[PDB]
């Protein structure tokens, strides 16, 4: 069966710059190669067919070239919406096979995170549970640290974090940090604070609120 090699697995480019994805077939497949785009949580979408044929609905920005064993998918002037995984697929011989995929990463300007802290809802408290949620939104680079403090004392237990993939809207990243406690544990504490430490600042960005 035909092996499709896509290397590098990750490609980093600056905004508006031209980028080229590589696809090499283990044997000659003429121009029987097709390219698909798959955004985070989305289904694959056909971009180019038979190595270089345009698909209606796809931005002119996208183009393909090559024949034989080496193929290229190019994007003229990359923009945020192009952030996604790209796969090649061959139909020269049975069975059809897919390349392992290349992720497009965009290197934009640094951006400090927008921090928001939210007290648990009354609806949740009514169930004997209390979740304190903190959003660290639209920052770059993605490297970032979050710290929790209850009544001035760092807290670690009950904290779960989640990081999004690079956003196809503005090339930034976001992170959520959730401190879950029982209604009781929550009732015997005054202030809850979330602190974000990011490259954009020598000092942490802090948001707090008192249960009263």
């Amino acid at each position: 069966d035909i092996l499709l090699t896509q290397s590098p697995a990750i490609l980093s480019v600056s905004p508006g710059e031209r980028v080229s994805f590589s696809c090499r077939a283990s044997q000659s497949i003429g121009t029987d190669i097709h390219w698909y785009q798959q955004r985070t949580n989305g289904s694959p979408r056909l971009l180019i067919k038979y190595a270089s044929e345009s698909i209606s609905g796809i931005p002119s920005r996208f183009s393909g070239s090559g024949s034989g064993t080496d193929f290229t998918l190019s994007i003229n002037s990359v923009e945020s919406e192009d952030i996604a995984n790209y796969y090649c697929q061959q139909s020269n011989r049975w069975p059809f096979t897919f390349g392992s995929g290349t992720k497009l990463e965009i290197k934009r300007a640094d951006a400090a995170p927008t921090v928001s802290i939210f007290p648990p809802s009354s609806e949740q408290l009514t169930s004997g549970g209390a979740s304190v949620v903190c959003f660290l939104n639209n920052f770059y680079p993605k490297d970032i640290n979050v710290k929790w403090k209850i009544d001035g004392s760092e807290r670690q237990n009950g904290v779960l974090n989640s990081w999004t993939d690079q956003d196809s809207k503005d090339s930034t990243y976001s992170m959520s940090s959730t401190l879950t406690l029982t209604k009781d544990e929550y009732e015997r504490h005054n202030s809850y604070t979330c602190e974000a430490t990011h490259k954009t600042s020598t000092s942490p960005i802090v948001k707090s609120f008192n249960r009263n």
Binding site: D1, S91, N92, R93, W94, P95
Partner: peptide, 12 residues
């Protein structure tokens, strides 16, 4: 007839 047979090119 050809599809299913690994390596056949007569498949479209």
């Amino acid at each position: 007839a050809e599809r299913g047979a690994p390596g056949a090119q007569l498949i479209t």
